[PDB]
Structure formats: structure tokens, C-alpha cells
């Protein structure tokens, strides 16, 4: 029981969230 | 079930979320 | 030959979701 | 085996949230 | 409980949160 | 203590947090 | 005779934080 | 002059935090 | 001097704070 | 708008090859 | 190269191309 | 402002090539 | 034409290349 | 001719390269 | 605004070359 | 204000190179 | 008043290099 | 402080190189 590459974003309880974005290769991104 | 490789986002619950793009190879992202 | 790969996105008890997306290879996305 | 890759972004209960982005590697990015 | 590379960020109890962005490698970076 | 590396940003009880960038190779950053 | 790599910025009760940034190779930055 | 590196950066209870930059190479910094 | 790397700013309680740099290596920096 | 990703592996005149695998999200790979 | 999402594997006159896959995902993979 | 995300593993004229992996996000990979 | 992020492994006339491990967040590779 | 973020591992005229490993967030590489 | 990021492992005219790790946040690496 | 980052690592005219490693933050490096 | 952030490892004309690592911070180096 | 940021580790015309260790912060460095 191992892990090696553990990639979680806003892996839990949330109440309010306004731009989200995950990606390791990316580009021009625009929050608003 | 996870093992080595964990790709999670907001993988929870949520109450208000407003734009949630994932991807490795992107471009351009634009979130209102 | 076993598999250690896990991908995915937000899956649970979720209240208000606008705008989302998965994707490896994908370019402009635009969220409102 | 000497590999342990930890990568946890947001992954906690969290309020409000403006502006998330994730990427080891990116080019031009802007939060409002 | 022993990690080679490990990577937190916003990994606890939040109130709000207002422009995060988290990369190896970025370029051209501006929160409002 | 062992031969590995560590990074933690912002793993606690945190109230209003603005402007927040995590890149060991990052160029341009305009925390408003 | 030991070793270890420790990089651990802002872990603990905060309030207001305006301004943080966390980077080795960190090129042109300003805070407001 | 040799040994394990800890690098730890405000890691206790604070109220406010202005302008937080950390990073042993560091070009150019303007914090307002 | 000592011998160890141990890189320790501000590790207790503060009230507030401004403008903090931590850094070897730290050019062209102006805090207000 | 859609924005410019480009994604090569080898180009012509290769001559001699011996092992080349892609893949964006993939686990498990042994080349001879 | 262009304003989309361009995948190249391999280019003509390649001449010997001996293991070759391409997937963005999949799990399990051995060539000889 | 232009943004652009180009990956290239190799290039033209290569010769002989032995051994070659690519992947954003893999884990568990050995060449002969 | 301009480009922000560009991620170089290789170049042209390369002659001999034996063991090429590209990825941005892998964990366990080995080359012979 | 703005290249901001430029990765690049090798240049061309390589000649002879026997082990090459690129990683932004990666972990437990050998070579041999 | 002002800033590049450039970072480069190796350049033309090589030759020979055995062994190279190349990563700005990695761990536990063994070159023979 | 005008600001930049520039890492270079080895130039033209090589010729031999064995063991070569380069990170920002890299813990337990080994080489032959 | 700062041009910019440059790093250097090694210039042109090195011949014959053997062991060879850089990093802002390391822990646990060893060369043969 | 305030001024030019230009860190050279060697300079060219370097011949025979053996156990070339470079960083701000070391730990454990041991050269053969």
C-alpha cells in the first residue's frame, strides 16, 4: 500500500470557489 | 482504486463552484 | 501486467457546479 | 524505490476561494 | 511516514482565499 | 534526519490570505 | 553526519496576509 | 560549515502579515 | 558562524509584519 | 479562441529507433 | 505550431522504428 | 499579451535513438 | 512567431542518444 | 521574439548522450 | 511589467555526455 | 523597473561531461 | 536599481567534466 | 543589496573537472 505521484487539488469539503484550474502544462488563463 | 498515479480535483462536497477545468495539456482558459 | 494509473474528477454530494471540465489534450475552453 | 511524490494543493476544508490555478509548469496567468 | 519530494500548499483549515497559484515553472504571474 | 526535500506553504489555521505564488522557477509576479 | 532538505514557509495561526511568495529563482516580484 | 539545510520561514501565530517573499536567489523585489 | 544550514527567520509569535525578505542571494529590493 | 499547444516526440530522419513510448497520463512502461 | 492542439509521434523517412506506442492513457505497457 | 505551450522530446536528423519515454504524469519506467 | 512556455528535451542532429526519461511529475524511473 | 519561460535540456551537434532524465516534481531516478 | 525565465541544462557543440538529471524540485537521484 | 532570470548550466565547446545533476531544491544526490 | 537574476555553472570550453551538481539548496552530496 | 545579481560558479577554458559541487545551501557535500 504506496503511493508515488499523488496530485489532488481541492480534494475536501468546500463552501464557495470561483476560478479553478489544474493543469501542469498549460498557459494563458484568465481568472475572473 | 488509487495505487501510484492519484489525479483528484474537488473530488468532495462542494457548495457553490463556479468554473473547475482539469487537464494536463491545455490552453487558453478563460473562467467567468 | 497490472494497472497503477487513477484519473478523475469532482464526483460527490455537490450543491451548486457551473462550468466543468476534463480533458488531456484540449485547447480554448471558456467558462461563464 | 526511492520515489514519493506528494503534490496536495487546497486539499482541506476551506470558506471562499478566488482565484486557483495548478500547473509545474505554465505561462501568463491572471486572478481577479 | 517518510516522503522523498513533498509538496503542500493551502493544505489546512481555510477561511478565504483570494488568488493562489502554485507552479515549479510559471511565468508571467499577476493576482488582483 | 534524512537525505530529502520538503515544502510546505501556508499549512495551518488561516483566516483572509491575498496574493499567493509558490514557484521555485518563476519570473514576473505582480502580487496586487 | 546527517542531511535534509526543510523548506516550510508560513505553518501556523495567520490572519491577514497581503503579499507571499515562495521560490528560489524568483525574477521581478512586487507586492502591494 | 557543512550539514543538513532547514529552512523555515515564519512558522508561528501572527496577526499581519505585509509583503513575504522568500527565496535564496532574489532579482529585483519591490515590496510595497 | 555556525555549521549547519539552518536557515531560521521569525519562528515565534508577531503582530504584524512589514515587508519580510529572506534570502542568500537578494538584488535591487526596496520595501515600503 | 483556442490556443497553441504543440505536442512532438520525434521528427524524420530517424534511422535507428529503439523504444518510444508517449503518453500524457500513463503508469508502468519497460523498454528493451 | 499552429492555433490548436498538434500530437506528433514520429515523421517520415524514419527507417527503423522499432517499439512504438502511443496513448494518452493507459496503463501496463512493455516492448521489447 | 501572447501565450504559447510548446513540448518537443526530439527533433530531425536524430540517427540512433535507444531508450525514449515521455509522459506528464507517468510512474514506474525502465529502459534497457 | 513568439512563444511563452517551451519545453526543450533534445535538438537536431543528436548522433547517439541511449535512455531518455521526459515528464513533468513522474516517481521511479531507471535507465540501464 | 519573447520566449519567457524557455526549458531546454540539450542543444543540437549532441553527439553522444547515455542517460538523460528531465523532471520538474519528480522522484527516485537512477542511471546507469 | 518586466521578467524572463531561462533555464538551460546544456548547449550545442556537445559531444559526449553520460549522466544528466535535470529538475528543480526532485529527490533521491543515483548517476553511475 | 527591468528584472530577469537566467540559469545556465553548461555552454558550447563541451566536448566530455559524466555526472551531472542540477536543481533548485534537490535532496540526496549520488553520483559515480 | 537591479538589471538582473544570472546563474552560471559551467561556460564553454570545459573538455572533460566528471561529477558535477548544482542547486540553491541541496542536502546530501556525494561524487565519486 | 541594490545591485546587479550575476552568481558564476567556473568560468571557461576549464580542461579537467572532477567533483564540482555549487549551491547557496549545502549539506552533507563529500567529493572523491
Same mark, same amino acid.
Given at each position: &500500500?504506496? @503511493? @508515488?505521484?499523488? /496530485?489532488? +487539488? +481541492?480534494? &475536501?469539503? %468546500? !463552501?464557495?470557489?470561483?476560478? #479553478?484550474?489544474? !493543469? /501542469?502544462?498549460?498557459?494563458? %488563463?484568465?481568472? #475572473?
Amino acid at each position: &500500500e504506496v @503511493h @508515488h505521484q499523488k /496530485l489532488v +487539488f +481541492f480534494a &475536501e469539503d %468546500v !463552501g464557495s470557489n470561483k476560478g #479553478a484550474i489544474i !493543469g /501542469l502544462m498549460v498557459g494563458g %488563463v484568465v481568472i #475572473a
